[model samples]
Target chain A: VLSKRDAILKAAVEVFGKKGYDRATTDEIAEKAGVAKGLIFHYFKNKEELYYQAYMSVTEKLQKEFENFLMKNRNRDIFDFMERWIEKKLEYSASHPEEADFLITLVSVDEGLRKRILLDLEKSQRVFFDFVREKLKDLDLAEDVTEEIALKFLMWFFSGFEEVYLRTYQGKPELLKRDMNTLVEEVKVMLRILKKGMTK
Target chain B: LSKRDAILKAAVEVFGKKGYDRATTDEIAEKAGVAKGLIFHYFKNKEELYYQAYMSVTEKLQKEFENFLMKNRNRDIFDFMERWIEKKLEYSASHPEEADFLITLVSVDEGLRKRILLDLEKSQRVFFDFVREKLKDLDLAEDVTEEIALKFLMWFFSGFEEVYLRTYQGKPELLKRDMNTLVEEVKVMLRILKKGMTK
Candidate 1:
């Protein structure tokens, strides 16, 4: 038997993930969870608080999985490491569609809501940056490409690509017509171009 | 003045000063010397007014940039881009109100951000097409297709701007002071891409 809190949270995730923040309602979430609407207020205080908690729970799981993958894959080449990292992310997103959808909603949330989560989010990102920096020490980079420059370029590439991708697709699943394999191949081609540009 | 234009101009001014969250249509109506109902008649709501004002500002900025570039003949892709970056930095320093308004707009409004991204995509396609023409006139390594080269350039600048401009708000003096050296740094990054990063 699921605890009442867990049941309500999962339902909140599903509804919030589907309808997004502006359209989702506490009444529907309570109905989905098969609980009283008053019980939701008792447990969550308000819609904003519930949404925040729901967002955090999903984000924390994703971060934990990413951290585990990072630690386990510390020995790979830098380019290969990132490619695999992206592949892992794709796999996780595929397996956990609801959670993935919830994460997508992050970009659309209010500034006030984002501020509530930024401290923890930035803390995790710092850990990721530091981990990558430490691991780059053992890799053989080109003479002209210092570790900092390589890291900076790679980070820029990923960040830039993400903005372009999100804009092109607009986070709508219907627009995602390409298969994962084809997507992965396209990513590999770009990585190959960057790798050839970077390596000796 | 046309009612729509007056309304948009006033919207930008008020939105720039008070920001989107705090701005009200009544003040906008007062500023534009129009009834609040006229604002709704012209634009569907406060959101639409803000969106229209943002679009107008960005379109104006884009035209100003295009006009600026037309004054000189750039020698190559690198030269064109350097000019572009320098001009953009100068615009931000000179037009801090519009620039800061845009920054706030993206930070708060995802709906507007989506629309703005489409506008940016359209503008960038025009820019990259210009670059493609420049690239055709120059010599490149055999393996480097124009498409790959374009993607590389796109990633480099987009990445640099995304990170750099996020912290660039309220730092207009820093941009003004480092304008020349900043262009020099961009030139260096271009050189690295031109020669390939390896030994």
Candidate 2:
């Protein structure tokens, strides 16, 4: 059985995904949840408060999933870990298209929302950055690449993969699934290239 | 009536220059030589006005491309492609606002984006068909799919357009040089595609 808070969160995601935060009314969310409109106000105070809760929920969910993978794959090398990470994200995006679209729309539409989301995001990123830094430290490579550069490279690589994935999924879902294996292999190759560059 | 056109015109200029989110209706009205209340009188709101301006820009660009296509129908595909690039560059040179508006539209999420993209998809289909017909007489091999060729051309065109616009910001004189290189590069790319796919 879902708690009242869980029901509201679920309704918020659906409403926010459909109407966007600025356009979505609390009344609509309450009606969708089959609760009184004031109950939403009782929990969230306002629409922005509801949006913030949804955004944090999404970020926490993503971080938890990725963290679970990292913990389970602790024995793997950095290159293998990075490849798995990309594949995991792709799999998640494929299975959770609505969440992906909702997140994308949220970031794309509202500046205030973006700033608010980024505040939490920056902290989460710092945690991931520290983990990657520790992994790089373990390697003790000859070439001296700063942590910042590594983070930037990883971000860019992930961004490129995400762009390709989203475009393929949105424009040609059949093509996306057909080429998934090749795409993953290509990403592995790219990661290997970066790893070799760092090691040398 | 004149105030309405003025608002729309200024909207094109402002939205094209500053982009949608950054552009202000007040500034647009001021540029149009009208009061802010007059802007409201003309258009119900800012979003509606911006949508109208975007549609107007889209129609104008489509007409320009249509004119060039009709005029160069007798030419070879390569020649026609070069002329199309020239026409686009010329249009952007004269109407930087329109070019910026287009780039912003593609990269950003806006009310008009979906409609504009649907129109582009239709245009791409037409261009692909034209290319396929052109390649029909060339005696290509069975493996040379028209889809692959079309995708390659589309990627190159979009990449080159980004580079072209970036270069234009630095040197307007380099537009012709960029167009020349773009045409040569595209021809070479097409030739490679023909050899690899046809044989």
Candidate 3:
């Protein structure tokens, strides 16, 4: 059985996901949750508080999912782990459209929310950076490829391609199919290019 | 002419310049050479005026692309694509305000976004279908999906628009050379896609 708090959070995920934070009304959230509109204030104090809690809940869930996969495969090399991490994220976005929508809106809409999420993002990024740095050190490639430079290059390349997919799906839903094998392969190719320094 | 159409035309100019949110009805009225009360008389409020202005802009943008596509149907798809990119850049250069307004619209509210996206999807169906037919003519074996091709095209278009607008706003001279190089790069990218990645 779900607690009242859980019910409100669940309702918030849907409301905020659909309407966005600024536009979503407390009344709508309450009706969706099957509680009184005043109950939201009773639990969350205000709209901003409710939104922050909802955002945090979604973010933490996604982060924990990634961390679970990473922790299970701690012995794997950085490149392999990075590939898995991205695949896992892609899987999450595909399976949980509501959560994905909420995160997308959160990042793009409010500047303060973007900052908060980015700060949380930096922690996970540091973990990935350290892993990459360790792998480079093992390869004795540290001198040629600094961790910061490699991380920046990889992030930019992946983000660029990911933005393409995001926009494609957002603008034209008729185009997105379940089989994203080509998309994944393209990402792998870009990753390979980054590591090998753009071989023709 | 009806006051509504006059207000809408003026609103388009204002909304195109300052964008939907920042544009004021008073400014639109003054620009239209109409009384302030006339705006209220025709439209219920500012939102309706903005919506009509956006619809006008969308139709204009759609017609521009449609005319080009219809005129150049016989050309190679790649050639048409390149020309379309160049023409869009040209249009943006001539109508900076409309470009700004579109940028603002995509970045703003979901209701506005839904309308824009719906219109864009409608416009894109014509292009996508056209490209799908062209790919069929090529008879490539790997089954070049419309989705993949569309994804690549949209990324380039949106990314290029961002780069173009930033350049135009920051340094207009840089836009000319940058757009040319960007278009050439797009040509190269399309060729690579056409021949498949096996090459």
Off by over 4 Å in 1: A1-4, A34-45, A107-111, A139-147, A177-179, B1-15, B18-79, B94-98, B101-126, B135-152, B177-185, B195-199
TM-score of each: 0.72, 0.51, 0.59
**What lDDT tens digits, residue by residue, belong to model 1 across residues B1-199?**
8999999888887887788888899999999999889999999998888888888888887787678667654766676777778778888888877876776665457777787678777765756677888877667654556666677677677788887677567687887887776666565556556555222
lDDT of 2 by residue, A65-178 (tens): 888987898658887887788788776766665576567656544677678787888797565567776787677452335554455445444544454455566634466668
| Model 3: CAPRI class | incorrect
Fnat per candidate: 0.32, 0.00, 0.03
**lDDT scores in order:** 0.75, 0.67, 0.66
Model 1 chain B worst lDDT run, 10 consecutive residues: B190-199
Top model by DockQ, which number?
Answer: 1
Residue range A127-168, candidate 3, lDDT tens digits: 666666566555433222444444444444455566766766
DockQ of 2: 0.05
Candidate 1 lDDT over A1-200, as tens digits, reads 76888789999999988999899999999999999999899999798899888877777787888888878997787778778887777666656777757767876788888887777677766666777787668767655567777677777777887776566655555444455665566566566555666665
lDDT of 3: 0.66
DockQ of all candidates, in order?
0.30, 0.05, 0.07
Q: Candidate 2, which segments miss by more than 4 Å at Cα?
A: A22-28, A31-34, A107-109, A140-149, A167-179, B1-199
Ranking by DockQ: 1, 3, 2
Chain B TM, cand. 1: 0.82
Global Cα lDDT for candidate 2 = 0.67
Task: Kindly give the stretch of ten consecutive residues in candidate 1 chain A with the minimal lDDT sum.
Answer: A169-178
Best by TM-score: 1
**Which wins on lDDT, candidate 2 or candidate 3?**
2
